[PDB]
Every structure is written in structure tokens, then in C-alpha cells.
A paper describes a structure:
In contrast, the structural analysis of the [name]-[name]∆C3 isolate, that yielded more progressed but stalled 90S, revealed two distinct, but tethered particle populations: one was identified as the [name] [name] complex, while the other exhibited a series of stalled 90S states. Notably, the particle population with the [name] [name] is not a detached free complex, but part of two rigid, connected modules: one module representing the H/[name] [name] core that is composed of [name] snoRNA, two copies of the canonical H/[name] constituents Cbf5, Nop10 and Nhp2 but only one copy of Gar1. The second module is part of the later 90S, but here found externalized from the monolithic 90S core, as it carries the 18S [name] platform helices h20, h22-h23, the ribosomal proteins uS15 and uS11 and in addition three specific 90S AFs, [name], Kri1 and the globular N-terminal PIN domain of [name]. The model of the [name]ΔC3 mutant includes the N-terminus, the KH domains and the C-terminus up to F227 and hence ends upstream of the applied truncations. Importantly, within this higher order complex at a resolution of 2.9 Å, parts of the [name] 5’ RNA hairpin and the complete essential 3’ hairpin can be well traced, with the latter hybridizing with a region of expansion segment ES6 of the 18S [name] (nucleotides 797 to 844). Unexpectedly, in our [name] core structure, Gar1 interacted exclusively with Cbf5 in the 3’ module and a second Gar1 copy is prevented from binding to the 5’ module due to a potential steric clash between its interaction partner Cbf5 and an extended region of the [name] RNA. A further inspection revealed that the AF’s Kri1 and [name] together with Gar1 clamp the H/[name] core and the platform modules together, therefore stabilizing the overall rigid bi-lobed structure. Here, three major interactions can be seen: first, direct Kri1 binding to [name] via interactions with the bulged-out 5’ hairpin RNA bases A129 and G363; second, [name] directly interacting with U565 and A566 of the [name] 3’ hairpin, where the protruding U565 inserts into a [name] pocket, while R86 of [name] establishes a cation-pi stacking with A566 of the [name]; and third, Kri1 and [name] interacting with the single 3’ Gar1 copy of the [name] module.
Author numbering:
A (entry chain C): 33 to 126
B (entry chain A): 122 to 182
C (entry chain I): 212 to 231, 261 to 296
D (entry chain H): 2 to 227
E (entry chain L): 11 to 126
F (entry chain K): 1 to 175
The structure:
RNA sequence: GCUCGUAGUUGA
RNA sequence: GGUGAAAUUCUUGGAUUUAUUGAAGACUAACUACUGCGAAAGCAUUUGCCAAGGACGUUUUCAUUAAUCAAGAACGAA
């Protein structure tokens, strides 16, 4: 596991076995980027990035033994620093 | 422009929330092309200028 | 080879005294009883004790 | 001597009483699924987690042979087995309740998956309750395995059971007579009785069992008291 | 329709009990043990005796009108073993072969605080 | 002996026993400075080692250290050395090594403590470059008090790696 | 059995 | 009921099994532990009160302050 992980998302609700998170990070995650806790333990990987620019959500593909119903609202999910890329890339260039 | 039918996998507790969700998806959006599309699947920003919910049947979903 | 033979050399050699795959013994390193540290990095939620909450 | 026993004319020596006939879908004569879902849940120690996280899919496929649904919850630290609509065997859920428990007590999955067979039985014996001193408990627990495992081997050949000692438990898998003998040996071993006395008793019992004339009378004069 | 009883099976290493009661257990319909079937005391826990006991119990249930039974399986428990005897699986399978629909299956073994 | 230092020593010995499989009796090598200091200060070295380790002790010396002891020409130090049981080192008699380098050749094989020795030496940079070697307990006599050195960083790293492989090997091996 | 601790001994 | 099989016992005055209630002396299932805490003995239901502590960091009116310790004393065992 990486030494430095940054808080990425906050729990919103489960959806079809996946975890929906409102992004509490300014940057956009890499596809299939692993999702951690404060204990540096992986709960899953980023499955889908969705939502408007002001309010970004992402759904996590839960791993083996990780259940979406086990988590409660207000739980924070963490991502590695190198797995974030700036939002200016997806916007069209001037 | 599109007229689209969405099928929900379960019945909503609140009807109006669906319309609210549609109002959340109006604007600049983060989208990835589906697997069926021949376009390469990378994350892009696409603008939905205006949307309107015509009808919703929560029993028919 | 055969079990019963080994059993009488077990009693004759006094093998129970320490020296101065249907079964577990066929697995190597079965002689060691594995022990683990009390603290592991785990995914399991850990509730706080009452003493720690009172200290907070 | 039991009094007020009635005669049983149907009982004869021809019937093999201990045979287990196979259970199939046609054996479930009601023809309907189980009325309500039956579930069994257990917790496991934290050190087993990653191992479970690796093997769970294989575990799932095993229970897919018996229409049993399994759920691993690493956040809760629990393993759950439950019946489905496809389930037809009433007993196979209970064996499932054994399997995860055997998986919780450091028994490997290739060994523990044999509990789904009909002839196999299991026992998890608590050894951490007998004595409170740590050094005495460690010494008595090491007496079970013995030097180089030989005593453990001497148990496994005599009771015909797979025996795994872990933490505060001993997990034994085999026939019912072997489970009875293993429980006796383990519980006496935690009570400061060395297992070699029980091993010698099982040897004398095994050699007396071969002689047919010694079956009716008592074996107490042959057996050395301890 | 469907009339429910509760089948309580005491599966020990020496003997088996097949006992159908009502839902509360206050009133009982049939109670046949494995010792009523076999002459020898060594065979009271055999799958044959348990199968015959469950057949007799399910015949009485069909006589009174019980169509489905809930299952409460039980081992000796307490200070003794928590493994059900060889007769419990046989009694369950014989109740299934007799035509009774199976409800919930749960384990009612008395589990102590494990210290005396 | 106070209970706190004894408890700390017991915890360190548990770390050495779990990771590096140290077993009673502990095999302790002594150095010639320690022999001289125990001679002059009249310190009972086997009793001090039995007190510090809280277990049975087996005391050894090499050719080179006892050879330097004859070079010091101290009869009491030679006698004190020769009560301890003998463990030979493969070094030249005419040109013996320095006691520090000899005791490292005895202890440090391929960057690890193969023979599971305990080093009781007074010399200091010897103790530094034996702290570089993992799983080597260090003991020294200072001001008539015999002190076991704290657990080195290499030993703690080895213990952490050992617990990590315990999580994924043995009975927890997926195979 | 564990700890404290006196006479005496060592270093100060 | 128990056993290798039996036997001593309890049992149509109803034993065993099931349901409910009362009393007694106890223990705190899984998690869970040879690595946590405690000088040992030993120590996991919830909530309060009391005093004590370990490790880490910053340091000290800081050595004739320490180490070995017969006697003796506290706890435990008995
Ligand atoms: Zn040398």
C-alpha cells in the first residue's frame, strides 16, 4: 500500500452491490484505481465516474468480502495521490 | 434531441426524486462511452443543455 | 509404511518425552503450533472502549 | 438393566444400520422448496481474513454443488451460509454451518470441504477454558502435538481423525467414535493428564477388539488404571 | 392449506429423539426415540433407528394433519459436545422423504458461557 | 532487579524467541574486556547473565579473545575465562584476529546470526556494527550494573516482516 | 512462587 | 443414561423429551489471543466512582542516588 493516501469520497448509498460516493476530492480519479481506508486496507476499486462538474460522484467496485450494506453514511474512502488527475484535462483546451 | 424511456430496477420511495435526479444530470457531465460503442472509452465531458421529464410510472417503473 | 509398527517404536523409544493428505501430520510443519500477534491491519471495524471515550 | 422394553420383531442382523443412502432431488417428496430461509453465521479471527479473501470463490463453488449461498463480510468479520430455493437437502445447511466454522479454526479448505460428505463429522473443542495460567496452558497444549508432532500422529492414526490444534480450539474431523475419543483425550490433556496414558489405552482397546471372545466380558482387568 | 408443526431432534452420540410439537411446544403430537426401533443399545444412535423413528413420527403427523414442520436440531451441549449425533441427519432426510415440507432449520444446542 | 527493566528485558527476549527462535538455554559469547572488568570489579558473570536473561546460560569464548587474555598476562582473567566451556574458532594461532573481528566472524555469517548467539561485550563500535546485524542481543556491564541493550531496528523490521509472512503463509497459504 | 528489603560485597 | 459392549442407576407413583415459573452456586459463547495489561497470582456483559500505571517525546537541584542481597515484610499458593 502507498504511504500517502488522500480522502476521495464520502458514502452516499449502495446501488446494485456498488458503493456510490460523493467526491470530497477536487481531482478526478484514475479508472480502476484502488480505494482504501485510513487503515490503508483496500475495500475495492473505482468502477464508474459520473455526475456534473460541480458535484462529482463515483461508484466503487467492491472486492471479495466487502459488502456495500456494511458501510454507513459519513464513511470516508481514500485514494492514492498518484491515482488522481486534474479536471482541466477533460475540459476542452482554449 | 432524444426522447428516452428509463427502466428502474426497483420502485422509488419518492416519485419526485426521479425528476430531481434528472435536474442533477443537466449541464456539463462526466461520461464514459459504453462497451457497445465503437468510440474509445475514455472519460469525457458532455453538455446536456435542457431536459424535461415527460411521464413517470412508479408501478410500471 | 504401516501405523502399528510406528506405534510400538513410539512407546519403546519414549518419543512423547522431549529429547534432551487425510491427516495433519502428513502436512509438513505440523509440529509447530502457529501463534499470531495481537494486532493486525484489518478491514474489521473496531469499537472504542468506554475508558477511551471517557478520556476523550 | 432397562425394564419396560417391548420386543422389536422387525430388527434383524441383515440390515446394515450405519449405511447412508444418497439424498437426491427426487428424495424430497414434498416437491416444494423450503418454506423459509435458514441461515447460520459465525465470526472468524482477523488473521484468517486474507486467506478467506483468497479462497472464498472456491468456497462458493463448493456450496454451489449443494445450492447453499455464502456471504463473507470482512467489515463485520463474519461468514454466513443460507439455504436457497434450489436447496433440497435439509441436512446440508448444517454441514455448511460446520464448514465455515472449520474455516474459522485454521483448517485448510481442501480438508474442510470434506465435511460436505455424508460419512464425515467434525468437533471443535475449546481448550482455553480449563486453566487460567498461560505457561501451564501452553505446556498442556504442546503435550497434544508432542515432540516433532509424533504424539499428534499417534492420535491421528488411533482415532482416524484429522486433528488441528489452533489457539483455544482443537478441530477434529472423522468418524463419531474417533470424535468421542479425541474429545476424551483433549479434555483429559487439559486437566493435567498426559496423552500417553490414553494412547496406551487405545492400543490395548484396539488389540482387544480383534479378539472375538473378549467382546462380551469387561476389559477393565486388561486396561491399566490411570 | 399448510399446517405447521415443529420437529425437535435431539441427536446425541448415544441416542436420537424425534419430537413433533406445535409452534409453542406446549402440546406435542408424536415423540419417537431411536431406542424404540432397535433391540441393542449400541444401535440407538444408528441412522437406521433414526430413519425408522422419523418415518413413524411423520406417519403420525400425516394422520393428524401436519403437512410441514419447522426444524430445531439439537446436540447434547453444555459441558459436553456440540456436534449433533449421526441420527440427526438421518431423521431430517427421512422426514424429507416422508413428504413433509421443511420450514426453518435452526440449531437449539445449549451453549454455555463455557466456564464452570 | 527492578520489575520495570525486567519486564522490558522479558519483552525483548519474547521478540527474539518468536522471530529468531531463541531457545533456553541461551548461548552467550563473552569478550575479554568483560572478563577483565568482572575480574577487577569482582562481578559474578554467569550469575549476572542468568539474572539478565532470566533463564539458563551457556558461556563461550574464542581463540582470539582468550589469546589476548594471555597477552595481558592476568592469571585471574585466564582462570575466569577457562571456567567457561570452550568453543573453537577457525583462525591462525600465530596471527590471531582482533577480538571484535573474531567475534563477528563467529556471529555474523552472510549478514545473519546463524548460530543464534548472544554477544556480551564491552566494546562500543562492535556493538554498533552488531546492531546492523539483525537478531543479536547485546549485553554490557556498566558501573557494576549489567544492562541488556534495547531491540535494534533491524530486529524490529525482521519481526514485522515475519508477522506479515505469517499472515499469508503456513496454514494461511492459499496454495 | 513474585516483589520490596537489612548485615556483607562491588562501583562510586 | 452410559459404554468397546455392558453394568450401577431413574422409570405407568410417568423416567427421558417439550413448554412455563421459582430457587441455588457459579461463568461472560464466537470475536480471542504463546506477541495486549499486570511483579507474580491472574485479567473481556453494561454504566458510574476511586486511586495507580506502561510505552513515546521534551527534559531534570538529578549518583556517597546504583548493582548483588542472608534476616525480615506485602501479595499469591497452601
Ligand atoms: Zn578467532
Amino acid at each position: 500500500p502507498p504511504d500517502t493516501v488522500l480522502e476521495m469520497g464520502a458514502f452516499l448509498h449502495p446501488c446494485e452491490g456498488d458503493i456510490v460516493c460523493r467526491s470530497i476530492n477536487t481531482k478526478i480519479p484514475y479508472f480502476n484505481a484502488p480505494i482504501y481506508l485510513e487503515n490503508k486496507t483496500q475495500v475495492g476499486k473505482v468502477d464508474e465516474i459520473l455526475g456534473p462538474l460541480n458535484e462529482v460522484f463515483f461508484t466503487i467496485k467492491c472486492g471479495d468480502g466487502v459488502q456495500a450494506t456494511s458501510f454507513k453514511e459519513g464513511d470516508k474512502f481514500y485514494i492514492a495521490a498518484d491515482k488522481l488527475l486534474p479536471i482541466e484535462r477533460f475540459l476542452p483546451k482554449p | 434531441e432524444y426522447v428516452c424511456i428509463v427502466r428502474l430496477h426497483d420502485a422509488l420511495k419518492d416519485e419526485k426524486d426521479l425528476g430531481r435526479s434528472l435536474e442533477n444530470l443537466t449541464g456539463a457531465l462526466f461520461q464514459r462511452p459504453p462497451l457497445i460503442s465503437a468510440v474509445k472509452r475514455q472519460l469525457r465531458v458532455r453538455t446536456i443543455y435542457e431536459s424535461n421529464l415527460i411521464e413517470f410510472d412508479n408501478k410500471r417503473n | 509404511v504401516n501405523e502399528e509398527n510406528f506405534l510400538e517404536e513410539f512407546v519403546n523409544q519414549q518419543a512423547w518425552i522431549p529429547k534432551k493428505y487425510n491427516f495433519r501430520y502428513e502436512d509438513p510443519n505440523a509440529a509447530e503450533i502457529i501463534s499470531y500477534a495481537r494486532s493486525q491491519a484489518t478491514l474489521r471495524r473496531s469499537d472504542d472502549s468506554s475508558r477511551r471515550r471517557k478520556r476523550e | 438393566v432397562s425394564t419396560h422394553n417391548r420386543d422389536k420383531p422387525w430388527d434383524t442382523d441383515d440390515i446394515d444400520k450405519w449405511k447412508i443412502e444418497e439424498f437426491k432431488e427426487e428424495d424430497n417428496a414434498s416437491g416444494q422448496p423450503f418454506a423459509e430461509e435458514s441461515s447460520f453465521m459465525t465470526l472468524f479471527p482477523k488473521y484468517r481474513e486474507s486467506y478467506l479473501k483468497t479462497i472464498w470463490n472456491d468456497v462458493t463453488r463448493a456450496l454451489d454443488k449443494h445450492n447453499i449461498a455464502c456471504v463473507l463480510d470482512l467489515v463485520e468479520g463474519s461468514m454466513t451460509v443460507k439455504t436457497t430455493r434450489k436447496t433440497y437437502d435439509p441436512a446440508i445447511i448444517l454441514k455448511a454451518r460446520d464448514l465455515i466454522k472449520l474455516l474459522a479454526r485454521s483448517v485448510p479448505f481442501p480438508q474442510a470441504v470434506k465435511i460436505l460428505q455424508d460419512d464425515m463429522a467434525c468437533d471443535v473443542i475449546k481448550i482455553g477454558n480449563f486453566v487460567t495460567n498461560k505457561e501451564r496452558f501452553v505446556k498442556r497444549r504442546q503435550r497434544l502435538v508432542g515432540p516433532n508432532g509424533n504424539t499428534l500422529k499417534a492420535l491421528e492414526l488411533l482415532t482416524k481423525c484429522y486433528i488441528l490444534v489452533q489457539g483455544n480450539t482443537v478441530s477434529a474431523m472423522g468418524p463419531f467414535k474417533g470424535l468421542k475419543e479425541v474429545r476424551r483425550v483433549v479434555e483429559d490433556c487439559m486437566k493435567n493428564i498426559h496423552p500417553i496414558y490414553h494412547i496406551k489405552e487405545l492400543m490395548i482397546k484396539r488389540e482387544l477388539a480383534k479378539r472375538p471372545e473378549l467382546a462380551n466380558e469387561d476389559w477393565s482387568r486388561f486396561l491399566p488404571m490411570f | 392449506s399448510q399446517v405447521f408443526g415443529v420437529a425437535r431432534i435431539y441427536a446425541s452420540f448415544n441416542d436420537t429423539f424425534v419430537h413433533v410439537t406445535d409452534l409453542s411446544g406446549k402440546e406435542t403430537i408424536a415423540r419417537v426415540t431411536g431406542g424404540m426401533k432397535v433391540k441393542a443399545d449400541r444401535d440407538e444412535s444408528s441412522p437406521y433407528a433414526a430413519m425408522l423413528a422419523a418415518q413413524d413420527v411423520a406417519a403420525k403427523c400425516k394422520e393428524v394433519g401436519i403437512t410441514a414442520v419447522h426444524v430445531k436440531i439439537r446436540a447434547t451441549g453444555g459441558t459436553r459436545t456440540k456436534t449433533p449425533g449421526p441420527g440427526g441427519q438421518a431423521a431430517l432426510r427421512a422426514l424429507a422423504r416422508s413428504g413433509l415440507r421443511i420450514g426453518r432449520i435452526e440449531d437449539v444446542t445449549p451453549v454455555p458461557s463455557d466456564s464452570t | 532487579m527492578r520489575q520495570k527493566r525486567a519486564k522490558s528485558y522479558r519483552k525483548q527476549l519474547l521478540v527474539y524467541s518468536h522471530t529468531f527462535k531463541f531457545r533456553e538455554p541461551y548461548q552467550v559469547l563473552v569478550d575479554n574486556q568483560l572478563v577483565l572488568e568482572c575480574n577487577n570489579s569482582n562481578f559474578n558473570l554467569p550469575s549476572g547473565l542468568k539474572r539478565t536473561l532470566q533463564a539458563d546460560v551457556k558461556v563461550m569464548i574464542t581463540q582470539c579473545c582468550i589469546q589476548a587474555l594471555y597477552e595481558t598476562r592476568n592469571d585471574g582473567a585466564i582462570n575466569l575465562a577457562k571456567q567457561f566451556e570452550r568453543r573453537r574458532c577457525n583462525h591462525s594461532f600465530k596471527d590471531p584476529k582482533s577480538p571484535a573481528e573474531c567475534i563477528e566472524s563467529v556471529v555474523n555469517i552472510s549478514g545473519a546470526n546463524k548460530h543464534r548467539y548472544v554477544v556480551a561485550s564491552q566494546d562500543i563500535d562492535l556493538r554498533r556494527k552488531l546492531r546492523t546485524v539483525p537478531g543479536v542481543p547485546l549485553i554490557h556491564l556498566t558501573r557494576s550494573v549489567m544492562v541488556m541493550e534495547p531491540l535494534s531496528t533491524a530486529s524490529a523490521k525482521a519481526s514485522k516482516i515475519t508477522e506479515e509472512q505469517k499472515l499469508y503463509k503456513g496454514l494461511n497459504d492459499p496454495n
